[PDB]
What we know:
Chain A: Residues 29-226 form the DH domain. Chain A is an alpha+beta fold.
Amino acid sequence: SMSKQLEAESWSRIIDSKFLKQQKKDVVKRQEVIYELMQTEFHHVRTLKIMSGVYSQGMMADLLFEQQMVEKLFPCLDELISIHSQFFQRILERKKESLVDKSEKNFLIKRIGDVLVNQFSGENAERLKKTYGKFCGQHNQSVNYFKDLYAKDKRFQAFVKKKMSSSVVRRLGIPECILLVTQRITKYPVLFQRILQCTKDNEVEQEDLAQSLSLVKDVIGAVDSKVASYEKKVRLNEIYTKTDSKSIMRMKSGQMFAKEDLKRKKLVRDGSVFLKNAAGRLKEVQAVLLTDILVFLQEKDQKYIFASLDQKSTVISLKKLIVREVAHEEKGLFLISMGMTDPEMVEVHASSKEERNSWIQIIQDTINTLN
Amino acid sequence: AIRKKLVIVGDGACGKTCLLIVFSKDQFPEVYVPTVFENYVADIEVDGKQVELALWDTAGQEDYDRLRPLSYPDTDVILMCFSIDSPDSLENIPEKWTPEVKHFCPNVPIILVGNKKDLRNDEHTRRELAKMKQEPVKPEEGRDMANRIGAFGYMECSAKTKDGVREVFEMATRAALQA
Ligand SMILES: Nc1nc2c(ncn2[C@@H]2O[C@H](COP(=O)(O)OP(=O)(O)O)[C@@H](O)[C@H]2O)c(=O)[nH]1
């Protein structure tokens, strides 16, 4: 079995001593890196399978967790198992066809680049983006859910202690498994890059490897961005619930805006600022820029309310909104709703001139994107 | 118990992975050094206290700012690394790494680690750095930085020679046991 063979700490130890002696240093080095990819992929699959076969299965059977509770700890686990089982088997296939003579021990992989380009392009890439985007995007919630269950659910705690006691190693407790999975994807560029630089005179392999290196970075870049989307969604939900059903704001159109309108909006940026009314008093408020609308909220009685400012709409469509600096006031900024017969102007004051400028740029960017 | 989590951070190429590997591995990697580090739970004893010290690498996450901080929650000690052959990697310590680490890990102790100390007296290194009128980081510059960022302490090491490696993790463990 390969699982038994993969106990070998290095390529130089999995092959015969006689066969090792016949190879150049730079060959040994290159095979050592490929073996490491292969063996750490093996380890990763095993980790996923512990999450599924030990933890998930036990939670469902012993604690009567439904499928959907396990998804709060281990989202997309089945799909991850499918992706990496298949990737790993493709690596084994190439290994098997790289054996030397009738030996089933000694192998020498001349070419791995094509296997990598395939796994990290087309539909395989999209699957990786979608799956890691969701898993990493929910990573902190997943761990937080574990911690709350462990701290407060007596049965869950007892269950976890029993698993740690006998079934699985310390390295693979539940949050540790989650972090192992989240960290896997960013291991690939380092490994691929080292294989490339260890590949000295094979242009098609060098070219493939180069390609796979860039492609995996694109996958990671998209995953990282998707995590930013989840940070924004989770943050918007913090605000939405903090707002209480009580508060309402009329928009320039006449449309009444309320707490439930804040979902399912998409948040761009939020932060504390000050509104300046016509009397010139500064009112502490959360600027909440959404993709289509700008909202201002006062924190009163430990809950958010739609801010009041001289009977003006503080729920503002970005459609025909114009953004200007306040002349001779570096921390200030004007918002003019040109889509009315009496365009309402709203003056807002930041913590600094730097923060004032950044608020103007992102609002302008958000307006430009919208139209 | 006693279970502590350790995370290592620092610029790309400063020796984060090599340090974890040479510390963790049962036999020192004389011929092949692995490219990556998965995770590890080291059994280590300092001042008559048995600790299970989990080790985590951030290598690979330096460029991905939403992914990297997923490594931070529940950390009991941070190894914050620069390379002695890279004054540029030292200036990133207060400028990038310190505010990130203190924000994601408030009140978690930091060990400032100067890696690749075998290269301080390396002539090739001295010539390359000298092109930019730079030189290797001096031990005092390291200690002064540790003080300016509020580090629990300063340690120098070489993963190549293993010199100073055991002391880095023994210190880190002491830091982790504090309250
Ligand atoms: N001379 C010397 N080189 C080292 C030492 N530690 C690591 N390196 C090398 O520096 C490079 C980057 O090491 P790595 O651990 O990958 O850095 P990372 O990007 O922080 O993970 C590799 O070529 C290592 O072999 C060291 O202690 N001395």
